Design an enzyme around this catalytic site. Structure first.
Site, PDB file in Angstrom:
ATOM      1  N   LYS B 187       0.814  -1.225   0.000  1.00  0.00           N
ATOM      2  CA  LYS B 187       0.000   0.000   0.000  1.00  0.00           C
ATOM      3  C   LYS B 187       0.845   1.272   0.000  1.00  0.00           C
ATOM      4  CE  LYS B 187      -2.783   2.850   2.932  1.00  0.00           C
ATOM      5  NZ  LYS B 187      -1.991   4.041   2.624  1.00  0.00           N
ATOM      6  N   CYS B 296      12.946  10.621   8.248  1.00  0.00           N
ATOM      7  CA  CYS B 296      12.940  10.006   9.562  1.00  0.00           C
ATOM      8  C   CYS B 296      14.327  10.135  10.209  1.00  0.00           C
ATOM      9  CB  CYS B 296      12.539   8.534   9.412  1.00  0.00           C
ATOM     10  SG  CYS B 296      10.799   8.395   8.850  1.00  0.00           S
ATOM     11  N   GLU B 393       9.748  14.523  17.169  1.00  0.00           N
ATOM     12  CA  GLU B 393       9.954  14.617  15.711  1.00  0.00           C
ATOM     13  C   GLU B 393       8.990  15.563  15.084  1.00  0.00           C
ATOM     14  OE1 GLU B 393       9.001  11.211  13.173  1.00  0.00           O
ATOM     15  OE2 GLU B 393      11.012  11.474  12.421  1.00  0.00           O
TER      16      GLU B 393
END
Ligand code: NA
Ligand code: NA
Ligand code: NA
Ligand code: NA
Ligand code: NA
Ligand code: NA
Ligand code: NA
Ligand code: NA
Lengths: 489, 490, 491, 491
Positions: B187, B296, B393
């Site tokens: 996906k 990330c 983050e």
């Protein structure tokens, strides 16, 4: 069999926990009883780890990981400690075998020949790996040095079951220690003693304070405190599916790596061209070894139609022939189950078997006057959707199922949520490997069953587990891989 | 303005079909969603929306393709060649694919082309090479047994990927899985479906058997969850948010299912006293700003030895202010917008939280331009370790700069974090470089560099940044079950 | 039915065949040439430039340069891999041309050259392309005070010499692994079969290999071969061929403490036990020796048969032997071509005569065939004993000996009673017997219920006097690297 | 002050030293004996049984029989491991005895024998014990039609020959790897130093090694040595020592296509760059050469110094050289002992005289020392050039040449301009320079900001004429292994 002097002295006092290199009581003073399953008597009184005890062990293991001799030792020095530990366990082989017979219930001579030997050899094998846990240098570009390090993950929490108490401790600790981790480990409440005796030998071998910390107690308190501890870096468990699932859900909260070794309903398949004599013996031992209290027991014995009644007849005789008794009596071949609860559980499954229409061809009831004994039991007239065929019983109980083709037996064998192990009996070289290739299990034995060795990985496909123990493979569970890039211009 | 490639026009001028069992198909119920161009806010394409039922169709196809037919029977040499032909095709379509990335995700076209498409090509080339080399062990135990292991593909794998490097991320999932002989249900992120659904044409042309790969575009709550909860998927791998990462581990427990997760970070980038300061300034800036900070492993905490802290703050501020924001398909663009209105709002609320807790905006600290999801490169100073912006983050072009006084101090503070994806260390001393690399709790450490990735080097998180590794030989083990075979030869 | 010549083959053959040094097609410095023949017809097939010691020198200098500086030295491993893959794609594109060249120059059937040799060649390069990025050393946990790592560095310039029996495939057994490590190569094809390699040099160039990375020096063993063997600036040597040369090579290599890999000949046993599947074992025994005309180092030239099946298998082998269709490799009918040269035909017919005079009986074949070209009939010898010359020595033709036995212990001892140890076959349906017998045979490859299988991923090479070292697999890599242990003091 | 002899050492030396063959302590079949000497005193230290060709043959037969049948062939890998760990434990228990034997027979200081040689031997065996259960081959995914797996089989009976400079340690570098694979051993120690090995034989017996698994045959190169090198039933040979013998052994091994590993000499460079930590690098340069009296194949016998530091390093080396305490190994104050023999002392002094004749400056030392024993002063040569004999050739004494240089490119080139390539050291604080320079030096082991470090886990061996193959680490196992590729048809 008369108690060794060091066993009598050990059992003559409360049994202490082992934290930060010292024998101590639980902080809040709680104790619990472990029993002798052959006599139903209290065997010892053991200090009971609570949450606050686990938190003390975790800090001890953290400190020993982060500074001190364990963090500073070379790999050769680390290997030597593990090797010395093995030698000590071998020196105490009869003491440890007695405690296993007494506490677990299995025959002394088996505990000595199988369980102690395997624990010694597992520690020898992993001492070996300490100096050989290698990373890579990776040729990518002339402009970088690229290497990886396989670092220990840190503090590991470990929980083990009661069926092979000492051996199971070595499956957890030999690989973890070899990587340079430290350990908070919990034995099963039914069987704390061999491990807590073995603690003396970690201290004697010269393990630094806090490298190994043993916290005996119960799943819902000590166990769950390990599972939920914020400063444990990685968890490893062997035991119940329900506990396995719980462990995985809890470990989600911390993005913590899990290794699980769970149950099975392993098939042992006798094909038309098997050596039927040897296969009959493998099928019998396959389920009856350790009283059926064996995650990879060959509880479904599939037999080719031609041989079906021959094998049933032999299995029935052999089951009736087994000598039941106390594991500390010399003629015993098979001891009692570990607990009242387990006896009642296995007897419940036998009743459910009969309720669903199967026939007990041998056994199918308790044995003797006292102790948690169950007779070796053979079920026949069985179908694939019966509870006794689908579910792990965990006692000396086998279902025998005929089949007519190889495609069929593979399908039926694989039609399980479990996939821990399997046995295939055939003299044909092609059929053996072909059937082995198609069975969905972590271990396949061709023309044998129930073989384990330190050097060969063991674990489940599907819901029999996540990951592998034993071999080189076990080491990867206790390591974090660091990729270092050095710009060299 | 970079003019659209003919094949990109053609693709964008009809509904974007999903790819199941080797065929381009609509959703069974006919649902569609919109993906947008984040520089313009316009609808970019209309995309067929996978539902639970379409995931089930995909899983059935992957199951079938795994259990029998060409993918099951092919030699490893034949499998490798399929994967190499795929890489060659992606390379031939490099311009089309880089444009779709610039359009859909928002990044500069020339970076999509030079970085993203190049890495995907190389990741597939690298993994084709592994198919013939995924070896087990023969294990000398006793003269009475042959002992060997087989590293068997685990089966159908479900994979879920984020929007920040859409096509490259697809390759980190599928290269290793396909090399092992697994079959796949993947996906893409709903924000960035297009480069993957285009690349689908290339899997078909390369000759992949029906059902070996199946792409199901849609949303986390439906398509995403259907993958996570599917009983006939053998193994799952995910890159994305922590909440989803935890959710996925939680749900996988019910099936005792192996999980691989690549999650976020708060990676430190450490400039020691004997750094080459000019190189380290450039690496600190690129470390956070590369890909708009939507990375990330971004070097979002820049630790700077006290002697150089003012010098580095001054430089980062100037560099930030000079960055050229614009659409990824405009040639002069150095940094594009963020991926969505929600991300822009998220980053901007982080910035506000930073000001609210007392930090100073030394540069940036607001939206940019008249339209599209742009945020100015932002530099925060007067920061302390307990601040929300230094802990969490942010996932935009926002850097915090912290001074420090000792090596021991910076190692502590760098490690005092739930995250542990990556780290950078700048020092010219051979002993310091290695010593600091050793002590940092991070899956990748760069000495005198930042943000380098290659197919042959593993990547992934310590602590809450992940479980497992992608890339390298290491990735392969995620997609394998080990079978220990004992053959009695007595 | 004549197979029609590819236009590209006709063009190649219409001109003197140049050698390939430093990126260019060149003549010998001195302009000497030699002849290669068509062993079906005995006609001159091509005139080839003859490398002398001075041409080896020039190739070595070109390889040295390409190894020390320039694009081959600077390229990433990804870049190097991609060259090797693109070479493999080019070989596949030219598969018909190359298979015709094998058939013409070597003699083997065109279809076999195409389905077997060319495909093996392609797969070998694709497999080693895949290794370039994966040649890893170790990081070694010893002490907190050091980083310890190894590098597997390419050795440098490698000298390679290959035989005529599988000309192109053999070139790839040498170069695939060597190139994957980042070495540079001076390679001499057999004088008998230079042409497929020299045609393939076009494809190295087209793929984009840097100048001097590969250098092909066609010629003879006593001049070109000896020159490579004796060259002070070749770092390592690899040889496939005759024992006497293998010995020479090892001897000369002493003087420079140079690493040597050898793949030599064999007298491999193919063993049919009492519980063999006789159908497949008889086919396995026949193809094991007759494949490639018996010009195969791992040919199953000793066929041991359990006493129970001896007559059955001898009768079946004789029938098959007498049914083989001998002819030219470029005629579609052909199942077996000629031997490579007049010298080899004469050598094999000498062994046959030697077998007759020591008392063995020719049950099929045992003589030359057809009206021209170097054909020998498929030959089956019976009534043999283990001390015969024909049972001890490698014949290198379509000549088999059949030996009965009575017990497994006996057949293992007789199979192993040989200075050779290249390969073995074992036919038995029993899972224990197959592995036990495989374990006890001293051979580099053992096939259980098959024979003559090779694949790029599986190592191949001799025990005993069949060789030193392995080729193929990950194993071949280690021949082309030097291992460097680095210690970094970190306090 | 004298170190007092251990009771067990006195006992051992009070009788003829027997050799060890098939598990028994025996005399040479023909009764020949030879003397080993104490090189500090020049006294006869022991009388040792001398193996001849016939005794080699008996050891080979015993090893052959131990390999083919009996407990060693039947034992599990866990059982074999355990024998090796127990041997290591015994050596450790006899550490003082073994260290004295080394001081006495070889010459080196007792305390260094103890702390270095004995510790390394113990740890070597413990390391290799751990490999026995971990020598894995491959399962190789090729086709669904076959199971392909390899076996790493022990080669068989192994012939090993070791030098005198680290007698016991060298014995472990040969036997640890070999025994971990399942091989059996015929091992000859150097005639100059047979004692520690022949003492250790008692501990192979006490550990429980089966009869003939290890066989120790002391004597001389031309008889014992040559008989091992030339034996038809030795499967593989490993040798550490001189070049002339290394080349002999490779030449002789050709006749049997026998695998050879050689560890030979060096002229290893120890490079001090402008940004070195100079104090540490001076200490590393002095120890690099003077350790073990320079009797060390990887000694840093060429100290290259950046010009800025040259004078400083020369002065320091000169002071340090003149400050070393020479004396007997069994005297507590001794920092450096004598050379091993009269012949070695004469060789080293002949070198020193050559260096003077060619124009170099003896900055320190350069002559014998003390009133008896084979002592040579630590010697520092300056005003040296690259073409001098003393700079090119291995001297094997406590003799260093000090060479200034001006650029890094220069020192690399000059460092690599050698037929040897055993080892190198590089001293620099800079992270890029260290790895870069290490990448370029053509040497088997590179130490960055250190020198002379060895560990069982880290391979060691030569590039170029310093050797073929590696010992130590995982790498060493491969020398003792034949790779068998098994194909199982499962169609
Ligand atoms: Na109990
Ligand atoms: Na599982
Ligand atoms: Na979009
Ligand atoms: Na984690
Ligand atoms: Na020819
Ligand atoms: Na050989
Ligand atoms: Na001596
Ligand atoms: Na060499």
């Amino acid at each position: 069999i008369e108690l060794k002097p060091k066993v009598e002295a050990f059992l003559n006092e409360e049994i202490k926990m082992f934290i930060n290199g010292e024998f101590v009581s639980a902080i809040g003073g709680k104790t619990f009883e472990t029993y002798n399953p052959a006599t139903e008597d209290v065997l010892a009184v053991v200090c009971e780890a609570q949450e606050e005890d686990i938190d003390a062990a975790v800090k001890a293991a953290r400190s020993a990981f982060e500074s001190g001799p364990w963090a500073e030792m070379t790999t050769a020095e680390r290997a030597h400690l593990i090797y010395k530990l093995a030698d000590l366990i071998e020196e105490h082989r009869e003491e440890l075998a007695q405690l296993e017979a007494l506490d677990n219930g299995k025959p002394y001579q088996v505990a000595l020949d199988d369980d102690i030997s395997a624990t010694v050899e597992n520690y020898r094998y992993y001492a070996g790996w300490t100096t050989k846990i290698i990373g890579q240098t990776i040729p990518i570009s002339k402009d970088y040095l690229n290497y990886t390090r396989h670092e220990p993950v840190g503090v590991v929490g470990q929980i083990i079951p009661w069926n092979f108490p000492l051996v199971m401790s070595s499956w957890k600790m030999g690989a973890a220690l070899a990587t340079g981790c430290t350990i908070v480990l919990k034995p099963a409440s039914q069987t704390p003693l061999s491990l807590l005796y073995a603690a003396k030998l970690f201290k004697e071998a010269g393990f630094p304070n806090g490298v190994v910390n043993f916290v005996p107690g119960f799943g819902p308190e000590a166990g769950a405190a390990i599972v939920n501890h914020h400063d444990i870096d990685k968890v490893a468990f062997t035991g119940s599916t329900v506990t396995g699932k719980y462990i995985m859900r809890q470990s989600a909260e911390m993005i913590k790596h899990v290794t699980l070794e769970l149950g099975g309903k392993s098939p042992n398949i006798i094909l038309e061209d098997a050596d039927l004599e040897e296969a009959i013996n493998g099928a019998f031992q396959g389920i009856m070894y350790n009283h059926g209290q064996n995650c990879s027991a060959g509880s479904r014995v599939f037999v080719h139609r031609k041989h079906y009644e021959t094998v049933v007849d032999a299995l029935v005789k052999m089951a009736n022939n087994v000598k039941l008794g106390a594991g500390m009596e010399k003629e015993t071949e098979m001891g009692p189950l570990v607990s009242k609860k387990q006896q009642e559980r296995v007897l419940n499954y036998i009743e459910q078997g009969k309720k669903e229409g199967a026939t007990v061809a041998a056994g199918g009831e308790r044995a003797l006057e006292k102790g948690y004994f169950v007779k070796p039991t053979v079920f026949t007239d069985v179908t694939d959707d019966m509870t006794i065929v689908k579910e792990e019983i965990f006692g000396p109980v086998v279902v025998v199922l005929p089949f007519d083709s190889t495609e069929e037996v593979i399908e039926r064998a694989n039609n399980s949520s479990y996939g821990l192990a399997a046995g295939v009996w055939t003299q044909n070289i092609k059929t053996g490997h072909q059937v082995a290739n198609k069975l969905k299990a972590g271990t396949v034995w061709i023309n044998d069953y129930n073989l384990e060795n330190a050097a060969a990985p063991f674990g489940g496909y599907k819901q029999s587990g996540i990951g592998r123990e034993l071999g080189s493979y076990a080491l990867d569970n206790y390591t974090e891989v660091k990729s270092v890039w050095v710009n060299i211009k």
